[PDB]
């Protein structure tokens, strides 16, 4: 509609310990549904959405063992990269891996992702063809060369084209009521003096799902302002999201400005402006 299943994996080395901290979170669209944290109480794959609690112990046992296996491999990978970069074992380093599938309205794979970063920088990524890799420096070239030798691409491609899509379909069925919905935003404009003769107008969108949204401001008769303060879309904590966008305008000219709110749940945008009480 479209939809996606994505996993986000993070391994952090700890100079002065054995095991790195290893975390996995899984998402369908904008909803986190599973988490594994090696340092947790306890270190198993566990639910983060009510609807996944529908899976039997077999599911939970198998994902926990896969998480544990991946953690061991990420431990190895961190040590391997220390070597590639000639780095010492007295500092912390990070490996991140994001992967998953986007599927279209007909339930078919639109694109697959499989990419890693070392210390927050692009390391290696599976190309859109799902057949070849992009490296970013000498170390990642070695990794790329190794993955070509063992045909890793075909293993990841098989997953992304098959099980990833199929599991996404299962999850969409399990969590249909919350995943397959649009809650449109409710919006209002607030007014806050900024100086003697300037006012901050803030256009709020609240209670919306999914997270994608766009707010625009403009002076009536002109193109959209670029001079706009925004915040990153943020979780309300109840499965919906919030966002706001602000402009500073002259006192007494508040109503010459208009905010529009666009969202998948709105056939037409909401149109708002400051209304004195």
């Amino acid at each position: 509609s479209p939809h996606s299943l994505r996993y986000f994996t993070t391994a952090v080395s700890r100079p002065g310990l054995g095991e790195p901290r290893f975390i996995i979170v899984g998402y369908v669209d904008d909803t986190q549904f599973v988490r594994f944290d090696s340092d947790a109480e306890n270190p198993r794959m566990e639910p983060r959405a009510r609807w996944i609690e529908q899976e039997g112990p077999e599911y939970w046992e198998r994902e926990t063992w896969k998480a544990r296996d991946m953690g061991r491999n990420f431990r190895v990978n961190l040590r391997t990269l220390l070597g590639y970069y000639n780095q010492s074992n007295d500092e912390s380093h990070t490996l991140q891996w994001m992967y998953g599938c986007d599927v279209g309205p007909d339930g078919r794979l639109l694109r697959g992702y499989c990419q890693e970063a070392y210390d927050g920088q692009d390391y290696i990524s599976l190309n859109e063809d799902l057949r070849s890799w992009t490296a970013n420096d000498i170390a990642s070239q070695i990794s790329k060369h190794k993955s070509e030798a063992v045909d890793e691409a075909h293993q990841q491609r098989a997953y992304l084209q098959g099980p990833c899509v199929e599991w996404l379909h299962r999850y969409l069925r399990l969590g249909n009521e919350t995943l397959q919905r649009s809650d449109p935003p409710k919006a209002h404009v607030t007014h806050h003096p900024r100086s003697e003769d300037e006012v901050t107008l803030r256009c709020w969108a609240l209670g919306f799902y999914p997270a994608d949204i766009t707010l625009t401001w403009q002076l009536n008769g002109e193109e959209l302002t670029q001079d706009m303060e925004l915040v990153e879309t943020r979780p309300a904590g109840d499965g919906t999201f919030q966002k706001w966008a602000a402009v500073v305008v002259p006192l007494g000219k508040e109503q010459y400005y208009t905010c529009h709110v666009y969202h998948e749940g709105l056939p037409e945008p909401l149109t708002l402006r400051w209304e004195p009480p």
Binding site: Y7, T9, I24, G26, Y59, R62, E63, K66, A67, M70, N73, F74, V76, N77, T80, L81, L95, W97, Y99, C114, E116, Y123, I124, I142, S143, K146, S147, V150, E152, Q155, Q156, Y159, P163, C164, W167
Partner: peptide
């Protein structure tokens, strides 16, 4: 469900 294996870098 998660991928079966990760890359060996």
């Amino acid at each position: 469900a998660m991928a079966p294996r990760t890359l060996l870098l």
